[PDB]
Amino acid sequence: RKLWAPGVVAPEYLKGDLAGDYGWDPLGLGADPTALKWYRQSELQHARWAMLGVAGVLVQEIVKPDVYFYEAGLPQNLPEPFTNINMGGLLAWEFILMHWVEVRRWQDYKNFGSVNEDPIFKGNKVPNPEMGYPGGIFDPFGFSNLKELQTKEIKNGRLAMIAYMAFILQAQATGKGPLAALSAHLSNPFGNNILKNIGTCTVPHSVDVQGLTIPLTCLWPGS
Amino acid sequence: LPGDFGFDPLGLLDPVNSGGFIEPKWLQYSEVIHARWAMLGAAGCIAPEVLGAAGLIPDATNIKWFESGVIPPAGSYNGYWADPYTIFFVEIVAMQFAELRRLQDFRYPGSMGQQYFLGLEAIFKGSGDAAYPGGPFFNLFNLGKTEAAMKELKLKEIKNGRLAMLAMLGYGAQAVMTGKGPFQNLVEHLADPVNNNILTNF
Amino acid sequence: VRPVWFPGNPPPAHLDGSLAGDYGFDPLFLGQEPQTLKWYVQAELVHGRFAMLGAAGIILTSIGAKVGLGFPEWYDAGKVVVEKNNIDFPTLMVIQFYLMGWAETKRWYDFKNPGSQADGSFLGFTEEFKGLENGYPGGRFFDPMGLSRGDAAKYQEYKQKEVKNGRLAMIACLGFAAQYAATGKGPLDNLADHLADPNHVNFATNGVSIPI
Amino acid sequence: RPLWLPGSTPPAHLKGDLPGDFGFDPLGLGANAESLKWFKESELVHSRWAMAAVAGILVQEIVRPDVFWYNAGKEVESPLGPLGLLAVEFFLMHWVEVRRWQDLRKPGSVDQDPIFSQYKLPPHEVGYPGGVFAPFIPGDLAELKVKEIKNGRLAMLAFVGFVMAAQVTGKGPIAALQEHLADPWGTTIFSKAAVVPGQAVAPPCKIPASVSYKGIEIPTPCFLQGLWP
């Protein structure tokens, strides 16, 4: 079972138990147990989220090669059937649903497996083996081996996290899309490179939404 | 201990009847600190000159080093996303933290990984020796595999650090006398080993 | 083991931990003697409470000012209202001093003689004008909600949070003072401006804070 | 046992003897016993008050619309003198309240009709007179107390909601609800106001200002209009 470097030691708690344990924590954060668990949970959160986000961005930019997803937050850049909706109502619905489901999984963390039953249809209850695995109905095909399964999961998830951040920075700098930037490096690899594109970013500097102008940002003083 | 040559013609490392700051522990500690600094400082003082000589960077940057703002009379640069003073302030606070906690370590050894510090204490336990706490970060890679290699590395560090102190003094004296850039002096003495010299600079 | 304000240095003799907020901070040894120390405890408590008051009042009036509700700015409210109504400086000052003197000298002689105030020498009263701790006169009136008489752990936690917020409020009131005396402005307004541009709307550009 | 937060744990003094309890005192207010009795009593009083008031406002707006319930104060006319109404109200209600208070301070001490000695209320707990007061009971006191506290707290919510909705729209709640149904998205405070570092917006108050009755000219400020968003 390898470590993250030829000729290095793994700290004790990074033993080889959590999927994708390469024994790496140079900043020593896996010291207290509860903190370690909370962090693992947030890691699952970020991994699965960034996976979703790359999946989205990619699929949309492909099927509609005109979106510039970075703008997909256009109150006007909204599909026909629901195209110019009241942000008030939208945010209302969204915030409410997320507060609910998030507090549910938070209670899960607080006491593992204590809200498995459906608090209305109590003839419904989810079998959760481990912290952050609802399973059961949360896994309809229920393929759960399971070890190498979770390892694959965390591996590709970290891949997704870094990939999404890279996409976003490419957008900020060159204002182009991912496929656009790749096709450009195809046009010329020497051209269309961050050396040329760096030192400036494509921010629209706090666009004005229906109500007001939300302060926008660049990730560094390139301008 | 590392890098000694028996050379102390003034003889201050004498460990007897010592006190105050004159104590080999603190003295060699200051030496290694200066070594690491001077190394960083030399790398910096040079980098942008050659970096713009090769033209890889926009000529907007690569001004001579003594003009980046440290001495406005020596010329100032602008374009920084904030003011020199507004940056100087956060610089004050960050260096206050780092230096103060390193000092608390050296004064009360091991006692700087105890107060709750967001879990950022196990690394600050380090060794019982300043300038060499090691630990997971300060020795990121487990370097010093053979302890012979470890002493070898300490020797090389002190060597390069003393070289760096000398080089930094060189940069100072050249930039004051000839007023040009360091790589400038290099290009010149290259062009004329004889007619580009402090003899010529008289 | 308690978090020492200067992480690494041990606390002095008199600073122990029995009191709320004992981060071991008295580098001037002003609390060696227990008389003086209990004394400065009561002083710090009353000051923290006053600061909490003042911060709340200033901030609310300032909000009422920015919003179009005619509320003046704090450093003027006094003169503006006294001239608005038919008030007299002398009568207001003298009544205020009367009542404050009464209540405060009662607290004083309580601190002196720790029990002689609920002695029925008042109208008929007792079990309320008797102290509970040094500067913690929770009876049926000063603690009418009655939390001091329940869950001593929760009560300790409340003393802690009280003194914490009190120190914070003291610092913030001095903040307000400097904010105004420097920018000749409204506090909330200075806030909005630094929001507008933190990089440039700040003391580094106020040209007074840093006198360069 | 039900808990307001399923999966959590109740506090210490909160046990489950009191009707309609769900271990809800995240600030441990119910520490001391006499304070606890006082607070239960006051809760019951407020609950019944809010129930009566919300039912009245509803049926009033239904039967006699176009008379603003919030404005019945000015808009009322009576051949009887307002001084007379306030005097009789103050007096008789002062009596009933001081009687209930005498009861609470000295329990079961005044349960006789002091004129009709023949008539005498049986002993009982606090906040539960019964007797003639409870001459007709279908079901069980156990569930009935529960329903009472439930509807009372709900009515408190309803009343304060009416207050805020009237301060933001000046409408009868029925018509405001018709409005909310008419527009699912726009009839929301989110659609009505918001706050962001850029700026703050608050919808305008609907009650204008000081209103003039017969000379008094009542000053009528909004409830903390300053922080409405």
Interface of B with C (CB under 8 A): 81-83, 85-86, 89, 101, 104-105, 107-108, 111-112, 114-117
Identity of the residue in A29, A35, A221 whose CB atom sits nearest the CB atom of B81: A221
Report the C-alpha gap between D109 and D151 in whole angstroms.
30
Q: What are phi and psi of D218, to 5 degrees?
A: -60, 130
Kindly state whether C211 is in contact with chain B, defined as any CB-CB distance less than 8 angstroms.
no
Resolution in A: 3.9
Do D and C touch, counting CB pairs below 8 Å (3 needed)? yes
Q: What is the DSSP letter of A16?
A: S
Q: Which technique was the structure solved with, according to the deposited record? A: cryo-EM
Total domain count, chain B: 1
Contacts of B38 (CB under 8 A, 6+ apart): B161, B164, B165, B167, B168
Q: What are phi and psi of A213, to 5 degrees?
A: -105, 120
Kindly determine whether residue A11 and residue B140, on different chains, have CB atoms separated by under 8 Å: no
Residue given tokens 């450009």 in the structure block: A184
Q: What are phi and psi of D10, to 5 degrees?
A: -75, 170
Question: How close A46 gets to chain D, by Cα (Å)?
Answer: 26
Kindly determine whether residue C69 and residue D225, on different chains, have CB atoms separated by under 8 Å: yes
Report the C-alpha gap between D138 and D140 in whole angstroms.
7
Identity of the residue in B89, B111, B116 whose CB atom sits nearest the CB atom of C3: B116
Helix (H) or strand (E) holding D194: strand D194-196
Closest chain B residue by Cα to residue A32 = B119
Report the C-alpha gap between C77 and C95 in whole angstroms.
20
Give the range of the structural domain holding residue B85, as residue numbers without chain letter.
1-202
Q: If you write DSSP's letter for every residue of chain B in order, what string do you get?
A: -TT--S--TT-----TT-BTTBSHHHHHHHHHHHHHHHHHHHHHHHHHHHHHHTT-S-TTS---GGGSSSSGGG------SS-HHHHHHHHHHHHHHHHHHHHHHHHSTTTTS-S--TTTTHHHH--SSTT---HHHHT-S---SSHHHHHHHHHHHHHHHHHHHHHHHHHHHHHHHT-S-HHHHHHHHHH-TTTSSTTTT-
> Distances in Å between the alpha carbon of B57 and those of A177, A197, B78, D117?
26, 12, 17, 106
- Supply A177's token pair: 């899309």
User: What's chain A's length in residues?
Assistant: 223
Kindly determine whether residue B137 and residue A26, on different chains, have CB atoms separated by under 8 Å: yes
Q: What is the DSSP letter of D199?
A: E
Report the C-alpha gap between C38 and B105 in whole angstroms.
35
Q: If you write DSSP's letter for every residue of chain C in order, what string do you get?
A: ----SSTTSPP-SS--SSSTT-SS--TT-TTSSHHHHHHHHHHHHHHHHHHHHHHHHHHHHHHHHHTTS----HHHHHHHHHHHTT--HHHHHHHHHHHHHHHHHHHHHHHHSTTTTSSS-SSS--SSSS-SSTT---SSSSSTT--TTS-HHHHHHHHHHHHHHHHHHHHHHHHHHHHHHHHSS-HHHHHHHHHH-TTTSSTTTSSSSS--
Q: If you write DSSP's letter for every residue of A32-100 in order, what string do you get?
A: SHHHHHHHHHHHHHHHHHHHHHHHHHHHHHHHSTT--GGG---SSSS-SSS-S--HHHHHHHHHHHHHH
